Amino acid sequence: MLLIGKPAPHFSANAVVNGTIVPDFSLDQFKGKKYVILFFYPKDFTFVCPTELIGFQEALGEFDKRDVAVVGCSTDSEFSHWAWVNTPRDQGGIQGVSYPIVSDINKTISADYGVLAGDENVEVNGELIAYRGLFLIDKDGIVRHQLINDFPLGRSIDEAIRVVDALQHFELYGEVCPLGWHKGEAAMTPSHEGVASYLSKLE
Amino acid sequence: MLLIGKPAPHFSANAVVNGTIVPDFSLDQFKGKKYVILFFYPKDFTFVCPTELIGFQEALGEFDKRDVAVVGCSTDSEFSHWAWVNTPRDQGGIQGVSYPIVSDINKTISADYGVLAGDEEIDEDGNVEVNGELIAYRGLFLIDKDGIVRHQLINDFPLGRSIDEAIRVVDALQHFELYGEVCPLGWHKGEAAMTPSHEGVASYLSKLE
Amino acid sequence: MLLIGKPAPHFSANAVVNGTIVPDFSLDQFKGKKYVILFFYPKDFTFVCPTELIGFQEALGEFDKRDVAVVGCSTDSEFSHWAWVNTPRDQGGIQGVSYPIVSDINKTISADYGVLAGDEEIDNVEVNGELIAYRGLFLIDKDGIVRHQLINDFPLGRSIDEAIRVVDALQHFELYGEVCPLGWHKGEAAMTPSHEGVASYLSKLEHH
Amino acid sequence: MLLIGKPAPHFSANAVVNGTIVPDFSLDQFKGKKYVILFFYPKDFTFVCPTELIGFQEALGEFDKRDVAVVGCSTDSEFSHWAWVNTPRDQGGIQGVSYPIVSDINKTISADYGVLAGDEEIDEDGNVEVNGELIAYRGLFLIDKDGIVRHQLINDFPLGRSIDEAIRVVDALQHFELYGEVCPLGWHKGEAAMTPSHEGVASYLSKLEHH
Amino acid sequence: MLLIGKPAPHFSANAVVNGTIVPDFSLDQFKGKKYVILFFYPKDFTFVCPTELIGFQEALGEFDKRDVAVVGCSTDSEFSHWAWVNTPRDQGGIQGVSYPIVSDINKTISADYGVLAGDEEIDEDGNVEVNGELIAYRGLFLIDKDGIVRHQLINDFPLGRSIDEAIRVVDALQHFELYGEVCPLGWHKGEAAMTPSHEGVASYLSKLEH
Amino acid sequence: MLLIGKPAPHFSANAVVNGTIVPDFSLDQFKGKKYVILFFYPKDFTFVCPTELIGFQEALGEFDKRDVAVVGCSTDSEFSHWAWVNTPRDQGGIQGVSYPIVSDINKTISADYGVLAGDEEIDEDGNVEVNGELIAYRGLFLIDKDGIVRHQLINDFPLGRSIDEAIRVVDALQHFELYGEVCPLGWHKGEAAMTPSHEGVASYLSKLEHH
Amino acid sequence: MLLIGKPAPHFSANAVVNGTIVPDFSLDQFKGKKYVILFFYPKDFTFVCPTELIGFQEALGEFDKRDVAVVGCSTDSEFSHWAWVNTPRDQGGIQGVSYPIVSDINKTISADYGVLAGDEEIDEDGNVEVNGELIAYRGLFLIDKDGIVRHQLINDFPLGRSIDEAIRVVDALQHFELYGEVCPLGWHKGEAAMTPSHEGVASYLSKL
Amino acid sequence: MLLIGKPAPHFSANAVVNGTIVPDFSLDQFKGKKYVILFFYPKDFTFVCPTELIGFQEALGEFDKRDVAVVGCSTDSEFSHWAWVNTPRDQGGIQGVSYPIVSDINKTISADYGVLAGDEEIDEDGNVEVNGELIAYRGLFLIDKDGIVRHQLINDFPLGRSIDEAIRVVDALQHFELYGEVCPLGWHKGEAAMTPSHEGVASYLSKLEHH
Amino acid sequence: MLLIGKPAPHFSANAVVNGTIVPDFSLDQFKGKKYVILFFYPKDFTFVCPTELIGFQEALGEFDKRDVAVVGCSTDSEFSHWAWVNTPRDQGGIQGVSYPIVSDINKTISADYGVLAGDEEIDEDGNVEVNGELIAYRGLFLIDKDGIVRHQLINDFPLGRSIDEAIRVVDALQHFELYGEVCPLGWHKGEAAMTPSHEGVASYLSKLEHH
Ligand SMILES: [Ca+2]
Ligand SMILES: [Ca+2]
Ligand SMILES: [Ca+2]
Ligand SMILES: [Ca+2]
Ligand SMILES: [Ca+2]
Ligand SMILES: [Ca+2]
């Protein structure tokens, strides 16, 4: 489903924050204060998912500098999350992951964000688990960027950081970010003069 | 909607291929033969859109080497596309863009791929009213040789995309197809992949330590 | 659609006025002030459409003297319009067209005015043909009421003369209460809408 | 209704042809043989309508030479039509009009062609009330030999139509059918048409800047 | 539909009154003042209809003396009516007909009175297809001064009506209104009516035996 | 209901024929053989109804000569009908009435012919409420040999009908059937009818004006 | 339908009371004052029906002494009833029947009491066809002073009813109302009733 | 429900026959062979019900002589019935009742025969609530050998029924079946019946008048 | 019916309490005062049901000590219940059963508690037919002092229940209510419970691994 330009759907669920189970976790707390990178993964105790979670843990300071809160989510229970953060990495665990890991135990968050796999007396084709979904949410709670990958295709922290940098650049300077833009490169004024001037300089 | 794991919706529209208007363009031709990178942009003759189109033209060799066809799409007419490829780049044009640029003139492609902006309503006697513009967001899809969507990405209007990220996802999909190894976070071609098993993930994570 | 005797459907869209993109263009501004000749064409950068747009530009004074605003419209974007008015005529452009060219980007204007081509069928929703505007033209009086409409197939260009003639007939009926007979032109004899009026008008045809 | 590019709706009704009442008149007979100019008017024995009908009768040869059948229609009965063609013109009649005048006595033809005036409403108990008069506006349709509508025009009650514009649209349609050239704004038979191509439109528009 | 004992449906249409087109004609004007004989015929410029209209014109005084307004109606336009009253009788016209002739141009009046011929059906493309002609049968209604229908009659197209029967029904209605006696079969003004009671019917039928 | 041009609704009920109760009486028996004058009255043992029934008995020969079967009907039972034909006329009875008197005991015939009085409603508790009496008004129908209704008439309760008008309408129907001439206003057997054509009506009206 | 324990449906119709046609006859008048024996019969001028009506007339005193109003009803008109009470008994008439005979001219009373014979079938358009005759079967109802039905009985057309059974049920109802004793099988006025309790039924059955 | 003239609804339930619980009891077995008197009572182990059941046992021979099978029914289980027939009469039991006593444990029989008390209603909460007790009133049905209901009677809870009235109605039905004579008011076996004709009723009432 | 965590459905019915028929029995009276063990059985005068009812009578003191009211229920009438408590046990009776035995005579309680056996289906005649018997399975519910169902059990007809398991679940619920410790598998009063926490479950299981 299309959430670009729309408010990130509200939820309130159990989560693991700093390795501790906490109730009533919501993205409300970040409105007006932090951007949010919210990412969904399919299953605790699997393969690409721990590497993605651990990598987000390693880059957590880079998101902190940018006023970005990192939030993970799967449809597993908060107790599976807790068991997993208490499993050492050399045993496949995600020990040391300290940002919030939301438990979408009813699958309503994954459904509302349009990342729930499977197809639906009531019978279900496939597994109702989340694909590798990622959303960039601005300080107003609006979705500005989304990405969904199939199960075997891990995501990239560099691209998430790049889109964060681009959004903040557009918010600061009103300049739109052209293809392949990175922090420090030339942006563009959104006008006829702007596009003619930017494209002439490239050639 | 959610197209991951599902066939990319079929279409058949006018397009500009190698600067020429052609009819009945479809992604059918690529089934069993090429991967497809399909990207939607909002409007001809604008700002971020020409930079994305030109950059895809410049990187076309990287996609050719990987058996990937690049296809652009907007809801503008095929003639607006043709005028745009016949406009020099220093005037905001996209001259030299040679891959197909599809005209989603009926907006059905953008709807089917879930990238169409705007909201529609039915009033008391107001028929269909639309809030906002029915144009495509900066949407991108990776379609494998069977026509299945394996990756999708949508950016708001002012956020241009990245060719490197598209190439990386192509490499990850092709690596998983060849070796059955899943690609971990931040993976690039030539780096260590992973065996999808308990021992595989445990051993992979031990090497990082 | 049947719009004669009914208000022209309201709209508010981006347009190019005097070669510049402007937002929130509507026919509201003309209610009580000007008549409107509103014409739809299918596609920017095509064939008959530039000749019609340029010709409406050349005859623009004939409409000004009659308190008629000329407004064109297609389902192309306002940026396509802007690119087209910046293309020289010898290359197929419509450079110098200065009256408002509305962008019906959502196709709701053409739908509401009954000029949108194509057929919509549900299976998703599939469309047979192209959802673009036919060569449609509407005369709207100062109260916002449609008094004349005409739609031509894609290859059949319209005529400025017939538009001016219908405008003259409407204004003559508004002024004198006389109905305009077949082939009436400004300055020719009209008719009083009564038994005596039609008998007298037709008798003179058999006297001269 | 939007009929451009679509078949002209079928009908079969009483008419006055050559001053005589005949049944089962339809435009089927013209498919593959003649173009049709079909025009609706609101009321027999009124004001603009006799001038339009008489003018079409006098210009009938111009349509005959172009393989065009002229057919008129209103929702009055065939007997009103018959009485009207037996009324001398100097008293408001349409004597001498010999082409078919269709009686749309049930108003289904006018409704199908999208020219029927009035507004239809249902009551709090289910009765059918009508605001205004269910009569035809000044509607005109050009139907090609395949029965497809290529041009349509509707005028308010006091605004008579123009035979010149009807002939011009016929000539433009026939020129496009014969030569595949599209007819630009204000085109008349014998003037330069246009090739529907990038080069064609560029060539046409460049020549206008000099001529 | 059955209108006996129910109000005559309201309408407001163009009509030709005394040979002149007038708008907003209604039977409301007659409420509390006059009875109404309202008759529908199918088509202007035809065959039985001019004879019925002319005959009503010739008998107009018999209805005036009885405080009865005569109103004709068809689904033709008011201009067809006007042309018809300006056509001489020796050419099939109805010249000299001066009472109101209503134009039921939308066919709603004929529908409301249940005299409209033809059959309407909606096809699966939305449009309405019609078998036959939506024109009025030869319908006649007697409406009292309260606007209530007391007598109705419908004839097929080739069967002209009878002025005598209309006058007889008017006289019977007025006699019952005045004296409260019910009118037996074949009753005419001046003949013996009947008291609506056991004794009344026994007495009336006894006298008929001689 | 509008029955002109439509088949008279079928029924099959008990009746009194020649003073005898008989079952399964229907107008089917007359199809192809006789016209039918079918008349409804409200109640046995009342006031106008016996005068109408007796008068139809007195004129029975006039209808026999014209191949017309006379049939009466009310929503009373066949036993009330039978008792009534066994009550002498000087006591309010209809002794001597010999044509069929149908018992519309279920009120379905009166409903089908559009002559049933009264108003039905559904009450609070889904009950069925009736305003007035579900009895037949003074309804009369002329049915031709094909079973099609050609003339219908309904009178309020206190207004007795007229045998002369029924016979006149019968003569008009039979004249149109025999000669194809339409019968003008006030036409009676032996007078001039009319050819349904322009010339026919013009000729008929000319003869009246100097007559 | 089951009316036992529920109010007898209200009605208001023409009737013949003491040989005279009267309007607006209803059982409301008896509420709080009299019991009602209400009986339906199929057709005036038939066979069992006159014997039942005459017998109810002859037994009228037994109902009067028990504060019971007798009311007959059929779907025939009030004038048919009046003609029938003016017919001598030796010719099949019901001369001398003086209690109210209701005219259920609309058949709504017979429907509301569930005694109307026949079957109604309805189609899409609503055309109502009927199998059989919509006339009342030989129905009888005992209504208490509150308007509550306490006993009902319906017989097929050829099976006449019994005055003794109606009077017996009246006696049983009045006995239960007065003494709170339930009436066993075959109970008659003056015979032993029963206390509605374990001991009451055990003691009653022991004596047999 | 109105069952007169209609087939007695079919059922198949457990019953106590001659003091023994048996399955699949139905009235089908009696079709074409015996009349049926089927009676419903509300509750086992109560007050009027044992007297009715015991009295029907005592009169069983009178019904046998008339080819009548007696069947009782309540919505109690077959085991309550069995316990009750094993309870001595001097303790309120129905020991010695040997004809079939049906267990309408699903209440469907009492519903089908229109003798079930109580009212069922559905809420907005979707639940089913019941006003009163869903038990059978004192209902009685006479079923002929073809399975058609010819007589029915329902009494309020405190009003016991009458064996005499059942016998009398049985005799009347059998008399009408044999002789085609209808039974007048108060008729008993051996008394004068009536021929269903005008003459029959006229003659019968005359003998009552003078004598 | 999943009632765990939801209020026990309300009812108000006739019952036998201490061998006496009483009206308007409800579990309302126990809210805030007593726990409720509510058990359904299929039929009076059968086989497993008397053993269960008598066994609950014998264990009544064990429930009294725990502030638990024992209530039985079947769809039999209150009079069948009364007869059954007046039958000696050596004849299959339940003499001496003094706690409330509810009569679910309308079957609404069994339906609301999800223990009603049988299958209902509506005929084409809108009629309701039932496959099987609408009787209660061997259902048991533990209801807390707030009226909330905390434990439920349903057995097929031939499988009698266990007093020990009912007492055990009562003890487990009361232990959790008093001390907030959850009761592990097979817990009995006096044995070690568990703190619902990570450390609590780890510590509980550590002690088991030794013993
Ligand atoms: Ca879900
Ligand atoms: Ca669309
Ligand atoms: Ca649209
Ligand atoms: Ca219509
Ligand atoms: Ca009916
Ligand atoms: Ca039930």
Ligand SMILES: [Ca+2]
């Ligand atoms: Ca139930």
